[PDB]
Amino acid sequence: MVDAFLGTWKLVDSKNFDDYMKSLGVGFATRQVASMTKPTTIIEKNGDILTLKTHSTFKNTEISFKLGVEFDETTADDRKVKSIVTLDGGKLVHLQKWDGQETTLVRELIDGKLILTLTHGTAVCTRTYEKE
Template identity: 45%
Template sequence: MSVQRSWVIGAADCYNKNNVGLLIRKTACTLKPDVIISVDGDIIKIRSESTFKNHDTIFKLNEEFDEVTADGRKTKTTVTLDDGVLVQHQKWNGKESKINREAKDDQMVTTCIIGDIKAVRIFTKKN
């Protein structure tokens, strides 16, 4: 899996049109998290580390699991690997979101989509 490594944030367009509360949205836009993606057998772990909060998502591909997101949402989540892209599908309270993580050269492009709203964060490979 080509996204398996440590990444640091490089650029982002923020979640300005999102249905996220103002305080959380402003905080999210200022965070500069490191993201570490690791694999141990069939278990994948995505760890986000920042000065504000650390968060782990641990899962097996193609298996639905209960996730508590970094912003506190309780979702039913399934993660798949589609043509080298790690695709995270989240469902909660009649809503859905999708997070795509794709490695391109020394970058990981993370695209978060909720309805017709899209936010992109570009991470660079950490040495």
């Protein structure tokens, strides 16, 4: 259920984020900033339009979209992508494509926590957020 995602979530743990960002082109200077940072993800719905915002001292982004309906997105790291977000049995699956490249962001609730798995080819990163 989408509804179970809604609310504000605060990053508490991060695993292999640096390699994920490097895998995407994020430069060293910026990786150092982003990694010590502890972002908030806010997930909202308004009818059948979801909005996911990322709030932090590094960057601030927001996306709004319908599930299964493809959309343009400019990412935190300034990639210009084609995105699609679907719901695969409680798992929010965010697929991005740009320049023949693909990355996936999977969001699932485990133990009252929101676990985001980021995958870019072989670079995999897991980021755990606590409900606020």
